[PDB]
Amino acid sequence: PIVQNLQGQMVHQCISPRTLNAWVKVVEEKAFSPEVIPMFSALSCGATPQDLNTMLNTVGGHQAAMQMLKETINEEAAEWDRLHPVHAGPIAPGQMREPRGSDIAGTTSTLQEQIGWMTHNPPIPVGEIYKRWIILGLNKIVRMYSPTSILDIRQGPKEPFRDYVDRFYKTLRAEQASQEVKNAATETLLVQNANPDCKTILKALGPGATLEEMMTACQ
Amino acid sequence: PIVQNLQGQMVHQCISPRTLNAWVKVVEEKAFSPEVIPMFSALSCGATPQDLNTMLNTVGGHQAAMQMLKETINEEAAEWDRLHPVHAGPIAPGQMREPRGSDIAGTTSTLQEQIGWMTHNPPIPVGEIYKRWIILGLNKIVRMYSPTSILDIRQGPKEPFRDYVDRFYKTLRAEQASQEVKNAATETLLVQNANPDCKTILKALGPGATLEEMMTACQ
Amino acid sequence: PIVQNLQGQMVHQCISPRTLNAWVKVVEEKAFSPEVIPMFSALSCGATPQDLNTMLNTVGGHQAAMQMLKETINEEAAEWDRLHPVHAGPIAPGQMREPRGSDIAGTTSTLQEQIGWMTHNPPIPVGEIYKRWIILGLNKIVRMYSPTSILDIRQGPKEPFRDYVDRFYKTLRAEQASQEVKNAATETLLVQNANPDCKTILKALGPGATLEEMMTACQ
Amino acid sequence: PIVQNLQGQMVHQCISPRTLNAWVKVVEEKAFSPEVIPMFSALSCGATPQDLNTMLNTVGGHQAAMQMLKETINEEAAEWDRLHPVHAGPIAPGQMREPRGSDIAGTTSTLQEQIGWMTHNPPIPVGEIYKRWIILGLNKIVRMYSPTSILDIRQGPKEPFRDYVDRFYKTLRAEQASQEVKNAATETLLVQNANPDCKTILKALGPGATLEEMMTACQ
Amino acid sequence: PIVQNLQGQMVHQCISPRTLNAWVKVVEEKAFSPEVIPMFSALSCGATPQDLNTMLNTVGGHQAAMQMLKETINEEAAEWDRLHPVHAGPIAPGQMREPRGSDIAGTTSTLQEQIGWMTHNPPIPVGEIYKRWIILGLNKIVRMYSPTSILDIRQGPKEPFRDYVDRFYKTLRAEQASQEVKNAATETLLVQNANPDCKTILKALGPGATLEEMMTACQ
Amino acid sequence: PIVQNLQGQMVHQCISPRTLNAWVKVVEEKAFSPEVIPMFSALSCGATPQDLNTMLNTVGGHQAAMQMLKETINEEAAEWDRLHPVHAGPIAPGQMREPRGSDIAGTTSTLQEQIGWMTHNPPIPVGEIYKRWIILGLNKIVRMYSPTSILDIRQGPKEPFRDYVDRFYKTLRAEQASQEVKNAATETLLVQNANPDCKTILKALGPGATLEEMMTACQ
Numbered sequence A, B, C, D, E, F: 001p002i003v004q005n006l007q008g009q010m011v012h013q014c015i016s017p018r019t020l021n022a023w024v025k026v027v028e029e030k031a032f033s034p035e036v037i038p039m040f041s042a043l044s045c046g047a048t049p050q051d052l053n054t055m056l057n058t059v060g061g062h063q064a065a066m067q068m069l070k071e072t073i074n075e076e077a078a079e080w081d082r083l084h085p086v087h088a089g090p091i092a093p094g095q096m097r098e099p100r101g102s103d104i105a106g107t108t109s110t111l112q113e114q115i116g117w118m119t120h121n122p123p124i125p126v127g128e129i130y131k132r133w134i135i136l137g138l139n140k141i142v143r144m145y146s147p148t149s150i151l152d153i154r155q156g157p158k159e160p161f162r163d164y165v166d167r168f169y170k171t172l173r174a175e176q177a178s179q180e181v182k183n184a185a186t187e188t189l190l191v192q193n194a195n196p197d198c199k200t201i202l203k204a205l206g207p208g209a210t211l212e213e214m215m216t217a218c219q
């Protein structure tokens, strides 16, 4: 990654064994549960494109997902190239060349180039641009790997309402509902999919109940 | 987080893998037992709003709780906006804009903005303001998830008084009794809810016995 | 805690995840065995009152003990206030106010205040003052939780004398005997409570035998 | 490795116990699964030839692989010597000598020599040159140790298409197919090797389906 | 401990959680096997008397040993006081007082005093003086806790000679034989205590065989 | 060890708990398998003779090996003394004395002396000289503890050739064959010791086959 040292200047530091192992182990343990994405983002703080590729390439399973991710990255790289075409022919001696989409993705750029861009004044944030492409891809993966529709999350007859709600919002998260829908669902699908006893109680509370209010009511 | 380096200036540092894993694992192990809150506060020392969101978003279960927390945060953000309305229209070039409630919560502000506020002289402590909202929300959660009323904590006939007292004050803590009530309860509900043999002994000691004195008496 | 950086100036550093987890886990594993107290003292090296409260508040069980500790702290705070009363009314602008007992204990003081006191020239050592109160309280707890009188530690007929001595001095430690008594006990209760065969051998060695000498004799 | 300290100058640092143990343990756990290579590259960030040899020599099993690697390194060293012959006879006093292939590989050079080359302006990147030879060798090993031809990866009748795709691309990776072939295979061998039900569905989608599209179709 | 910072000046640093846990766990696992002593010495590198007491006081079992150690320390402290008597009466204002034996042992000195002595030019090495007393005591403990005389280490009839030799020299180590005796024993007791078949072979090699030579001979 | 700080000057640093535990645990797990030696060398990067002795003395078993090592060290020390005799009589005040063999080995030198030599301009590399003696000794140990002659490594009738080759070269390594012999063995003993089916196939390939070629052939 690129860090500020103890003296305020931005320099390259090797990716740490702890960071490498943390990411491999979260993928092993959680696969593409939604919470793996914010973990990826945090563990890749400051990353160069080289570091992001290292993190993705150290994953041993999930190769269908990794090939889907490659495809997303290639789409975003192509759109970059559409928006930001680069001069053909020779680089000005000693000067910085402009990045292509494949330079952003770290396949045609060197670490030195990458450091040059990321530490330029002002920075050309190749690491952050690539990380956005990767996260776009990983969200597609999360949605693909979500095993259950929200329509099929219904409260069991002897299921504690809190347990039901946890299943409901875990499913909405994987299915990638917007926050508007998460906030809205409380007035609707969450009640509809409740068991008959809680549904009666929730219908009585009337509209505009907070989730806290609904959860207290059905405790 | 924002730290002071080895040379006394406040700078951003990436959240560490150890901090990320510590928080995920405490939630896995303890859920919303009351002692998880001081742990959250300590593990988020120095945090930016980005870092607080990272910590909350890396939690995989408990999504009913996380949706309740979102609701609390939105209430506090709305109250901030009531108290501290911001100018509409364009920012003075190069200058710092004033934070909105959603800027505090990290959803409409960038990391750079956040660092700018938190390192301003004097700081506009967006991380600490957000952390207070979050902790308000988490306390609501702890209270919701407390499984037992204090009324139902009574000493068993062969239960060591120390064991009973531990259950009693663990319950008062989750139920969020004030410290006045915790200090008061010793003169009352703790005795009333004691078994007959200890109750006799405690009633005899008379008023103003310390908890130490009561515990010695019923050993 | 407050540390000296690499350049010799005293600054605040966040409590580390390793320190947080070390303390929780020692309480989980050892409860209030006497050796937990020196561990607490070491793990709280440099602590502010905020940090000491964090350490105490991250403990999930033992709430009878934690309420006993609160009571001790309140007694010491009241004695501080008796010895060091503070001016009522407004603070001199920009200047440091004098700490009250509750400021020492971190309940009415901010982290900034605490850092101010602890880094004043000369320091007003609020962290060390509070840590002394806490340790006074924890020693009371250790004594309360000691399960066995020294009178009841007697050597079994087939118990190795070394094993007996270990039980004896582990018990004296929990019971909080002074060092005078620990050094004295060797001439007396340790012999009296020995089995008949070792008692014969020890009685023969005569007075002024070292513990090493007694242990060799009964090997 | 050679790192930049906190003050911007390139200096030698000892290889860490964490790095040493991470590499031994990844070889123990994964042997020569393809993802071990990017792990090696990351764990050897900044390495001198001494450090790369340390990493390879700390492996206890896999000695057939390690002898194959020695053979690769000797081939690359011989090609270096063909391209970059060095002066015979005495070194200019106090001056840097040019590296031979065996100097690159760390067998005839000292750590001091290595540091000299790697910190020269401009650097003679002996660590990076050697690491390229090693990785060439390790890729040969991965290909050798791949247990299954792609021809033999076919979807079972009750095998989820996602599971099949994961096996397919894990095999292509070990077999060291180019990225062109990985991207191409989607239009062909992946369909051909699908079970009859998915094959029907995929054949219907028509050409130019993304992997995401194929995977959705056969869910 | 007292360390040199990154800038070459000697300053106090808190004892680390890793060091605290390493020592507790080595005592738990190995008790007073001889190799615990060099471990203690290494883990206490740079220690103040406060730190050495912390390490000894964090041990929960072995209290017979810890009382024997207290006795040794008191003997060494008394001998210090005989050799280095200190002025009675008041300290010169602002100046350093001379340490007494109990000051060395950390019971009557403050951390500040200790740092003052250890960082004086030239240092009065209170930490190293105390560590020598402690190690004298711990060696006595190791010898006491050695379970077997060297006379009783004899090779079994089907015991590999290497296994026998390991038992022999592990016992000599615990019994605290000098190095002269360890080097000598090879010509004598080690042969005498060998089984008849190896004894024949060793007797034939003649005098002045190395241990390597003896071990090869009886392989 | 002696390290360069963050500012480029060579100073002493305490051996770390991680390094201490890594070495003890590798000896516990691997004993004197050949790969323990490069691990020792890496874990002792920068070591003083004090640190090397600490590492060797923290090993609890293997005392026959440790006594063999002492014997090697004494031989090398005696040869040092033959090559580099030192002046008898008093040291020039304030000046550095020349090391004897026992000074190199850390038994008659202080840490301060050792640091003085190792940080002299130019250094008198006592740590590196001692480490060479130790490694000479440890290699003797590895060879002694190798359980099987290469003559006895033959391919089983249903043993995969790769498995056989791994056993073969693991044995050559422990038996301490030169690299010439390791490279040569491929043309000979490795074929001779192959099962009849692979032997036929290897004999047909003809001379000068790479190990890769032989391994492919017998897959």
Ligand SMILES: Cc1cc(O)nc2ccccc12
Pocket (backbone or CB within 6 Å): A053, A056, A057, A066, A067, A069, A070, A073, A105, A106, A107
């Ligand atoms: C662009 C890219 C380069 C790479 O080295 N590995 C990747 C792994 C998965 C997705 C994309 C990748």
Ligand SMILES: Cc1cc(O)nc2ccccc12
Pocket (backbone or CB within 6 Å): B053, B056, B057, B066, B067, B069, B070, B073, B105, B106, B107
């Ligand atoms: C405001 C906010 C942003 C976010 O990214 N996650 C949160 C997670 C739980 C609660 C609030 C949240």
Ligand SMILES: Cc1cc(O)nc2ccccc12
Pocket (backbone or CB within 6 Å): C053, C056, C057, C066, C067, C069, C070, C073, C105, C106, C107
């Ligand atoms: C004064 C005080 C404050 C706090 O926050 N927790 C404590 C926990 C136990 C004992 C005292 C305490």
Ligand SMILES: Cc1cc(O)nc2ccccc12
Pocket (backbone or CB within 6 Å): D053, D056, D057, D066, D067, D069, D070, D073, D105, D106, D107
């Ligand atoms: C050139 C080289 C030196 C070495 O010390 N070990 C190696 C281990 C495997 C492959 C090559 C190696």
Ligand SMILES: Cc1cc(O)nc2ccccc12
Pocket (backbone or CB within 6 Å): E053, E056, E057, E066, E067, E069, E070, E073, E105, E106, E107
């Ligand atoms: C002098 C001394 C002080 C202390 O606090 N504990 C010790 C523990 C064991 C031995 C000696 C000790």
Ligand SMILES: Cc1cc(O)nc2ccccc12
Pocket (backbone or CB within 6 Å): F053, F056, F057, F066, F067, F069, F070, F073, F105, F106, F107
């Ligand atoms: C010279 C030397 C000193 C020591 O303290 N221990 C050693 C342990 C094994 C081998 C040699 C050793």
